[PDB]
Scaffold this motif. Structure first.
Motif, PDB file in Angstrom:
ATOM      1  N   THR A 117       0.920  -1.223  -0.021  1.00 34.45           N
ATOM      2  CA  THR A 117      -0.088  -0.046  -0.105  1.00 34.45           C
ATOM      3  C   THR A 117       1.129   1.218  -0.002  1.00 34.45           C
ATOM      4  O   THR A 117       0.388   2.235   0.456  1.00 34.45           O
ATOM      5  CB  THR A 117      -0.991  -0.042   1.245  1.00 34.45           C
ATOM      6  OG1 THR A 117      -0.175  -0.614   2.222  1.00 34.45           O
ATOM      7  CG2 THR A 117      -2.045  -0.966   1.059  1.00 34.45           C
ATOM      8  N   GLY A 118       2.064   1.002  -0.466  1.00 34.16           N
ATOM      9  CA  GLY A 118       2.979   2.397  -0.591  1.00 34.16           C
ATOM     10  C   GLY A 118       3.555   2.620  -1.856  1.00 34.16           C
ATOM     11  O   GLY A 118       3.926   1.369  -2.667  1.00 34.16           O
ATOM     12  N   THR A 119       3.759   3.956  -2.276  1.00 32.22           N
ATOM     13  CA  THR A 119       4.367   4.061  -3.703  1.00 32.22           C
ATOM     14  C   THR A 119       5.418   4.967  -3.515  1.00 32.22           C
ATOM     15  O   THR A 119       5.224   6.119  -2.991  1.00 32.22           O
ATOM     16  CB  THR A 119       3.071   4.270  -4.809  1.00 32.22           C
ATOM     17  OG1 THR A 119       2.071   3.641  -4.561  1.00 32.22           O
ATOM     18  CG2 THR A 119       3.830   4.373  -6.070  1.00 32.22           C
ATOM     19  N   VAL A 120       6.569   4.725  -4.327  1.00 29.79           N
ATOM     20  CA  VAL A 120       7.540   5.672  -4.058  1.00 29.79           C
ATOM     21  C   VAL A 120       7.591   6.524  -5.558  1.00 29.79           C
ATOM     22  O   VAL A 120       7.858   5.645  -6.344  1.00 29.79           O
ATOM     23  CB  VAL A 120       8.945   5.005  -3.890  1.00 29.79           C
ATOM     24  CG1 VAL A 120      10.143   5.901  -4.272  1.00 29.79           C
ATOM     25  CG2 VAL A 120       8.840   4.245  -2.449  1.00 29.79           C
ATOM     26  N   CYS A 140       5.033  13.833  -3.695  1.00 31.22           N
ATOM     27  CA  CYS A 140       3.629  13.519  -3.731  1.00 31.22           C
ATOM     28  C   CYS A 140       2.970  14.274  -4.496  1.00 31.22           C
ATOM     29  O   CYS A 140       3.305  15.521  -5.104  1.00 31.22           O
ATOM     30  CB  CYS A 140       3.131  13.422  -2.438  1.00 31.22           C
ATOM     31  SG  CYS A 140       3.923  12.194  -1.596  1.00 31.22           S
ATOM     32  N   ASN A 141       1.546  13.927  -5.162  1.00 33.11           N
ATOM     33  CA  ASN A 141       0.852  14.838  -6.216  1.00 33.11           C
ATOM     34  C   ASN A 141      -0.554  14.848  -5.611  1.00 33.11           C
ATOM     35  O   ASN A 141      -0.934  13.645  -4.940  1.00 33.11           O
ATOM     36  CB  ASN A 141       1.113  14.375  -7.451  1.00 33.11           C
ATOM     37  CG  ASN A 141       2.120  15.313  -8.096  1.00 33.11           C
ATOM     38  OD1 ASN A 141       3.274  15.056  -7.807  1.00 33.11           O
ATOM     39  ND2 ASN A 141       2.064  15.974  -9.026  1.00 33.11           N
ATOM     40  N   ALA A 142      -1.426  15.343  -6.061  1.00 34.22           N
ATOM     41  CA  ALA A 142      -2.832  15.414  -5.781  1.00 34.22           C
ATOM     42  C   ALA A 142      -3.446  14.047  -6.165  1.00 34.22           C
ATOM     43  O   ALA A 142      -2.729  13.197  -6.923  1.00 34.22           O
ATOM     44  CB  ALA A 142      -3.739  16.489  -6.668  1.00 34.22           C
ATOM     45  N   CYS A 201       7.229   8.239   0.207  1.00 33.45           N
ATOM     46  CA  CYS A 201       6.261   7.185   0.022  1.00 33.45           C
ATOM     47  C   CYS A 201       4.958   7.624   0.148  1.00 33.45           C
ATOM     48  O   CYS A 201       4.376   7.848   1.269  1.00 33.45           O
ATOM     49  CB  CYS A 201       6.565   6.044   1.081  1.00 33.45           C
ATOM     50  SG  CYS A 201       7.892   4.680   0.365  1.00 33.45           S
ATOM     51  N   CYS A 202       4.249   7.645  -0.918  1.00 37.96           N
ATOM     52  CA  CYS A 202       2.689   8.287  -0.713  1.00 37.96           C
ATOM     53  C   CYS A 202       1.776   7.142  -0.860  1.00 37.96           C
ATOM     54  O   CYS A 202       2.198   5.897  -1.244  1.00 37.96           O
ATOM     55  CB  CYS A 202       2.428   9.617  -1.581  1.00 37.96           C
ATOM     56  SG  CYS A 202       2.082  10.979  -1.015  1.00 37.96           S
ATOM     57  N   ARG A 203       0.477   7.468  -0.694  1.00 32.71           N
ATOM     58  CA  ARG A 203      -0.561   6.312  -1.015  1.00 32.71           C
ATOM     59  C   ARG A 203      -1.546   6.678  -1.697  1.00 32.71           C
ATOM     60  O   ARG A 203      -2.442   7.316  -1.245  1.00 32.71           O
ATOM     61  CB  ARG A 203      -1.143   5.702   0.503  1.00 32.71           C
ATOM     62  CG  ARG A 203      -1.078   4.308   0.672  1.00 32.71           C
ATOM     63  CD  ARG A 203      -2.864   3.928   1.215  1.00 32.71           C
ATOM     64  NE  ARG A 203      -2.833   4.281   2.681  1.00 32.71           N
ATOM     65  CZ  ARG A 203      -3.197   3.602   3.432  1.00 32.71           C
ATOM     66  NH1 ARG A 203      -3.029   2.499   3.725  1.00 32.71           N
ATOM     67  NH2 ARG A 203      -4.207   4.203   4.078  1.00 32.71           N
ATOM     68  N   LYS A 204      -1.577   6.160  -2.985  1.00 32.15           N
ATOM     69  CA  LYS A 204      -2.612   6.727  -3.923  1.00 32.15           C
ATOM     70  C   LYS A 204      -4.111   6.355  -3.149  1.00 32.15           C
ATOM     71  O   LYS A 204      -4.608   5.349  -3.573  1.00 32.15           O
ATOM     72  CB  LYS A 204      -2.459   5.805  -5.247  1.00 32.15           C
ATOM     73  CG  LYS A 204      -2.993   6.867  -6.411  1.00 32.15           C
ATOM     74  CD  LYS A 204      -2.812   6.091  -7.654  1.00 32.15           C
ATOM     75  CE  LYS A 204      -2.951   6.961  -8.916  1.00 32.15           C
ATOM     76  NZ  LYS A 204      -2.992   6.154  -9.999  1.00 32.15           N
ATOM     77  N   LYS A 205      -4.736   7.396  -2.631  1.00 31.55           N
ATOM     78  CA  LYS A 205      -6.042   6.985  -1.874  1.00 31.55           C
ATOM     79  C   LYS A 205      -5.907   5.704  -1.549  1.00 31.55           C
ATOM     80  O   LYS A 205      -6.637   4.638  -1.886  1.00 31.55           O
ATOM     81  CB  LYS A 205      -7.051   7.122  -3.177  1.00 31.55           C
ATOM     82  CG  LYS A 205      -7.288   8.690  -3.410  1.00 31.55           C
ATOM     83  CD  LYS A 205      -8.073   9.018  -4.542  1.00 31.55           C
ATOM     84  CE  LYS A 205      -9.597   8.986  -4.048  1.00 31.55           C
ATOM     85  NZ  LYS A 205      -9.860   9.723  -2.876  1.00 31.55           N
ATOM     86  N   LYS A 206      -5.589   5.530  -0.298  1.00 33.69           N
ATOM     87  CA  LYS A 206      -5.627   4.132   0.316  1.00 33.69           C
ATOM     88  C   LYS A 206      -5.216   3.309  -0.532  1.00 33.69           C
ATOM     89  O   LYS A 206      -3.990   2.890  -0.754  1.00 33.69           O
ATOM     90  CB  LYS A 206      -7.055   3.931   0.745  1.00 33.69           C
ATOM     91  CG  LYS A 206      -7.264   4.462   2.294  1.00 33.69           C
ATOM     92  CD  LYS A 206      -8.721   3.545   2.858  1.00 33.69           C
ATOM     93  CE  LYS A 206      -9.435   4.927   3.583  1.00 33.69           C
ATOM     94  NZ  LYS A 206      -9.629   4.450   5.110  1.00 33.69           N
TER      95      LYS A 206
END
Length: 48
Positions: free
Chosen positions: A18-21, A26-28, A43-48
Motif C-alpha cells: 500500500t506504499g508507492t515511491v 507526492c501529487n494530488a 512514499c505516498c499512498r494513492k488514496k488508500k
C-alpha cells in the motif's frame, strides 16, 4: 518502488504494497502514508 504504507499493519514477510515511491514529490489524488521513506525518495499512498 512499492514500499507499503509507513504503518499499514504488522506482518513482515508479506504486505499489500500500500506504499508507492515517486521520484520527485507526492501529487494530488494521493495521501502521504509516511512522513518520509528513503534518503532519496518518499512514499505516498494513492488514496488508500
Amino acid at each position: 518502488a512499492a514500499c507499503k504504507c509507513d504503518d499499514e499493519g504488522p506482518d513482515i514477510r508479506t504486505a499489500p504494497l500500500t506504499g508507492t515511491v515517486d521520484l520527485g514529490s507526492c501529487n494530488a489524488g494521493w495521501e502521504k502514508c509516511a512522513s518520509y521513506y528513503t534518503i532519496i525518495a518518499d512514499c505516498c499512498r494513492k488514496k488508500k
